[PDB]
Amino acid sequence: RLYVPGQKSQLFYEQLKDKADFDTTSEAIVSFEDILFLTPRGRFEISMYANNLRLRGQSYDYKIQNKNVLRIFSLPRLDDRHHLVILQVDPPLRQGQTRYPFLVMQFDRNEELEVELNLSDEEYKSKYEGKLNRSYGTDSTYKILSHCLRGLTERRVI
DNA sequence: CCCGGTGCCGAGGCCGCTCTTTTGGACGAAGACAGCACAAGCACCGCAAAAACGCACGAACGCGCAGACCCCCGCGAAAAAACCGC
Numbered sequence: 253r254l255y256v257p258g259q260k261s262q263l264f265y266e267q268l269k270d271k272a273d274f275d276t277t278s279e280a281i282v283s284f285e286d287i288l289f290l291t292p293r294g295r296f297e298i299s300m301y302a303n304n305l306r307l308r309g310q311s312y313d314y315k316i317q318n319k320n321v322l323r324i325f326s327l328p329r330l331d332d333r334h335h336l337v338i339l340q341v342d343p344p345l346r347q348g349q350t351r352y353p354f355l356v357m358q359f360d361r362n363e364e365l366e367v368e369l370n371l372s373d374e375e376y377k378s379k380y381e382g383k384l385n386r387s388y389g390t391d392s393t394y395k396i397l398s399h400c401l402r403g404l405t406e407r408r409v410i
Numbered sequence: 411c412c413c414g415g416t417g418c419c420g421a422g423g424c425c426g427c428t429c430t431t432t433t434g435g436a437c438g439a440a441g442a443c444a445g446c447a448c449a450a451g452c453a454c455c456g457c458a459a460a461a462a463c464g465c466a467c468g469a470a471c472g473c474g475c476a477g478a479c480c481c482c483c484g485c486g487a488a489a490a491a492a493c494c495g496c
Contacts, residue, residue: 294469311468 280306281370282400284393290336290356292347298397300404302379307355314345321405326398328361335359335394339401359394366390 256264268274284298297308305321307314316339325338337357344351367388369376376386383403388396398409 288470 278370281404282367284365284367284397288358290358291354292345292352300400302404305401305404312347316341316345318405321401321407324398324401324405324407324409326394326409329358333361335361335392337394337398337401357394357397359392359397361392361394363393364390365393365396367396 280299280301282300287296287298289296292309292312294309294311299306299308303318305316305318307316320341320343321339322342323340325336325340327336327338329336335358337359339355339357341353341355344353345355346352365388369380369384369386371380371386376384380403383406384400388399401407402409
């Protein structure tokens with residue numbers, strides 16, 4: 253990864269791409285950017301795969317297997333403005349000494365997101381039909397995330 | 411003062427019974443024992459852990475800047491209803 257300052261990186265990319273005809277690719281069934289975690293404290297991108305969940309953070313990357321997710325809680329905060337999504341993980345995530353058996357995410361209730369799943373029509377029909385929607389309309393981010401987590405981990409949302 | 415005779419007390423006889431000691435001399439070898447399990451507490455060593463303090467670092471908030479928005483300010487009109495009277 254290069255950092256090219258100035259208004260310059262797009263021209264640099266175009267020349268390189270044209271030189272060897274580089275073809276862009278798309279991975280991860282679904283990604284959610286800029287999610288606020290209360291525990292661990294910080295902001296994380298959540299990338300979901302068939303067998304595993306990735307949390308990408310500026311200082312810490314975590315790979316959680318879908319089997320290690322024991323429980324999903326979807327709980328409204330009493331402030332009537334934020335919604336909490338809570339993951340119980342076993343083994344608990346580690347940052348050094350004390351650990352994170354619970355991941356606490358905080359959403360705004362008014363935050364809406366539109367998301368298309370990165371799946372082929374044959375794989376969707378065979379594995380995910382009736383578990384996931386092919387496209388989610390502009391609904392609240394925490395609902396889409398809770399449904400995706402339910403479909404991929406096969407855990408009931410509490 | 412005297413006679414007839416009987417039933418009452420004495421020191422002793424004797425009978426059936428209960429209590430006591432004893433059961434030959436010398437020698438050898440082997441085998442199994444000879445208070446215990448149980449009890450609370452003293453004086454002491456040790457590990458697991460608390461409430462709080464000290465340090466490091468990463469991100470979400472403040473600061474700074476250029477932009478879009480509508481609260482705020484100012485204006486004029488109409489008359490509901492508040493303040494006064496008997």
